[PDB]
Amino acid sequence: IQLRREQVGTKASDFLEWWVIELQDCKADCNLLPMVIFS
Amino acid sequence: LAQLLEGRPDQSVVIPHLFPKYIRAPNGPEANPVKQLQPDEEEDYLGVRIQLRREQVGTKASDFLEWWVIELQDCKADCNLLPMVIFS
Amino acid sequence: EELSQQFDPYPLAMQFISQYSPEDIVTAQIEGSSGALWRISPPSRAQMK
Amino acid sequence: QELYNGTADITLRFTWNFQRDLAKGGTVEYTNEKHTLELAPNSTARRQ
């Protein structure tokens, strides 16, 4: 995971943050994570 | 949408008749718009428009905090209270 | 009576409106403004922009 | 303060979930299951 703060805790409130998911060792899933299901 | 997403509280949108007004909500798993009171399947369904409002508290676009206001493509009073009609 | 009026010259619409009971159709109202903000990642806001 | 110095364990639920269509049939619609991971008091991932 990656936590990203974008400046707009007081300073931690002026920064506004979210999360970006990836693999433990990402190859291209840092842009588009996959998952496979079978039904 | 580009004039909306520029971060300016003036502009608007045009919708080529996406929003229907009379929707059959069946006794089944899938609701469908009525094809009889609205017989045109792309045009009988009315038009919408949106307004993006930014209130100053992108860095400036983060200091501004924004939301959306819905209305008709040509609103009469639904810019205060939009209607929708369903039959079951 | 309005649904009797508002759909005059369409006979399929006439039969559809006269089909149901009076208490089978409702009219939802929706507030024009949002009840919240467009809370979105500024990366995603930039990508949609 | 839990991730800093809360001297106990902490769970993370990864929750996948799917929903099919209904006119295809099927008498249940919102299928899912959780999955748990456990992190120690002041562990390496806790420090991350």
CB contact under 8 A, B84 and C49: no
State the number of CA atoms in the 13 A half-sphere of C22 facing the CB. 2
Find the helix or strand (DSSP H, E) in which D37 lies.
Answer: strand D30-39
Contact B84, B38 (CB under 8 A): no
Cα–Cα distances (Å) from B36 to A30, B45, C8, in that order, read 49, 12, 12
Q: Measure the CA–CA gap between D48 and D3, rounded to whole angstroms.
A: 9
What letter does residue C42 receive in the DSSP assignment? Answer: H
- Amino acid identity, position B59: T
Q: Is D5 helix (H, G, I), strand (E, B) or coil?
A: helix
Cα of B53 to nearest chain C Cα, Å: 10
**Per-residue DSSP letters for A2-23?**
EEEEEE--HHHHHEEEEEE---
Q: Is C11 helix (H, G, I), strand (E, B) or coil?
A: helix
Do at least 3 CB pairs under 8 Å connect C with B? yes
Method: cryo-EM
- Amino acid identity, position C32: G
Contact A21, A32 (CB under 8 A): no
CA angle C47, C48, C49 (to 5 degrees): 90
Cα of B6 to nearest chain C Cα, Å: 8
Q: In chain D, whose CA is at the least distance from the CA of A37?
A: D18
Q: Which two tokens stand for residue A21?
A: 């998911």
Contact D38, D10 (CB under 8 A): yes
Nearest to B53 by CA among B13, B4, B15: B4
b or e along A5-19 (b: 16 or more beta carbons within 10 Å of the residue's beta carbon)?
Answer: ebebeeeeeeeeeee
Q: Measure the CA–CA gap between C29 and B78, rounded to whole angstroms.
A: 9
Cα of A21 to nearest chain D Cα, Å: 12
Q: Measure the CA–CA gap between B47 and B39, rounded to whole angstroms.
A: 15
Cα–Cα distances (Å) from D20 to A33, A34, D17, D27, in that order, read 21, 19, 10, 11
**Per-residue DSSP letters for B40-80?**
SSSSSSB-EEEEEEEEE--HHHHHEEEEEEEEETT-SSTTT
CA angle B88, B24, D28 (to 5 degrees): 80
Cα of A8 to nearest chain C Cα, Å: 11
**How many helices and strands, by DSSP H and E, does chain B display?**
1, 5
Q: Which chains touch C (3 or more CB pairs under 8 A)?
A: A, B
What letter does residue A35 receive in the DSSP assignment? Answer: -
Do at least 3 CB pairs under 8 Å connect D with C? no
Chain B contacts of A14, Cβ < 8 Å?
A: none
Q: Which two tokens stand for residue B46?
A: 């009315």
What is the sign of the dihedral through the CA atoms of D7, D33, A26 and A6?
A: negative
Task: Give the nearest partner residue to B87 out of C25, C45, C49, using CB atoms.
Answer: C25
Q: Which chains touch A (3 or more CB pairs under 8 A)?
A: B, C, D
Q: Which two tokens stand for residue B26?
A: 């069946």
Q: Does C36 touch chain B (CB under 8 A)?
A: yes
Q: Measure the CA–CA gap between D1 and D6, rounded to whole angstroms.
A: 6
Q: Measure the CA–CA gap between C42 and A7, rounded to whole angstroms.
A: 11
CA angle B23, B19, C29 (to 5 degrees): 65
Q: Measure the CA–CA gap between D39 and D28, rounded to whole angstroms.
A: 34
